[PDB]
Scaffold this active site. Structure first.
Site, mmCIF file in Angstrom:
data_model
loop_
_atom_site.group_PDB
_atom_site.id
_atom_site.type_symbol
_atom_site.label_atom_id
_atom_site.label_comp_id
_atom_site.label_asym_id
_atom_site.label_seq_id
_atom_site.Cartn_x
_atom_site.Cartn_y
_atom_site.Cartn_z
ATOM 1 N N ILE A 56 -22.565 -29.544 11.682
ATOM 2 C CA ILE A 56 -23.024 -30.402 12.768
ATOM 3 C C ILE A 56 -23.902 -29.634 13.745
ATOM 4 C CG2 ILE A 56 -21.041 -31.910 12.552
ATOM 5 C CD1 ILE A 56 -19.834 -30.362 14.932
ATOM 6 N N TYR A 82 -20.506 -36.327 16.833
ATOM 7 C CA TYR A 82 -20.066 -37.564 16.194
ATOM 8 C C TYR A 82 -19.960 -38.759 17.132
ATOM 9 C CZ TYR A 82 -18.785 -34.795 12.086
ATOM 10 O OH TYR A 82 -18.812 -33.969 10.987
#
Length: 107
Positions: A56, A82
Site C-alpha cells: 500500500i 484503504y
C-alpha cells in the site's frame, strides 16, 4: 501523511533504494483495536521490493524513511491505504492503521 516515531538502533546511513528488495518484520494494529496481522507468527518475514506499488501507499514511504536495523512506528492516514472502500472483512472503511515495523533487509 507519514509519521515516524523511531525506536533508535541502526546506522542511519544504509538506506534502501530503487531496484532493491527489502525484508521487514511487521505487525498490524488497529487504532483502539486489536492485532490483525503479524509477520512474527508465520516466521516468513515478507520479502518485497521497492517501487512496484505491491504494498500500500502508506507503508511504502515508511520503509524508505528507515535504515538497516531500525524500528519504526507508522501511522498511516486512511486516504492512502484503504479508507475509501475498506478491505473486505478485515479493515473497516475510513480507518487509521498502526504498524510496528522493523527493517532487517539485504541488498
Amino acid at each position: 501523511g507519514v509519521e515516524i516515531e523511531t525506536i533508535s538502533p541502526g546506522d542511519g546511513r544504509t538506506f534502501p533504494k530503487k531496484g532493491q528488495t527489502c525484508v521487514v518484520h511487521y505487525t498490524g494494529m488497529l487504532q483502539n483495536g486489536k492485532k490483525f496481522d503479524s509477520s512474527r507468527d508465520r516466521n516468513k518475514p515478507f520479502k518485497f521490493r521497492i517501487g512496484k506499488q505491491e504494498v500500500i501507499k502508506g507503508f511504502e514511504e515508511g520503509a524508505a524513511q528507515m535504515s538497516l536495523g531500525q524500528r519504526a512506528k507508522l501511522t498511516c492516514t486512511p486516504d492512502v491505504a484503504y479508507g475509501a472502500t475498506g478491505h473486505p472483512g478485515v479493515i473497516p472503511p475510513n480507518a487509521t492503521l498502526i504498524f510496528d515495523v522493523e527493517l532487517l533487509n539485504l541488498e
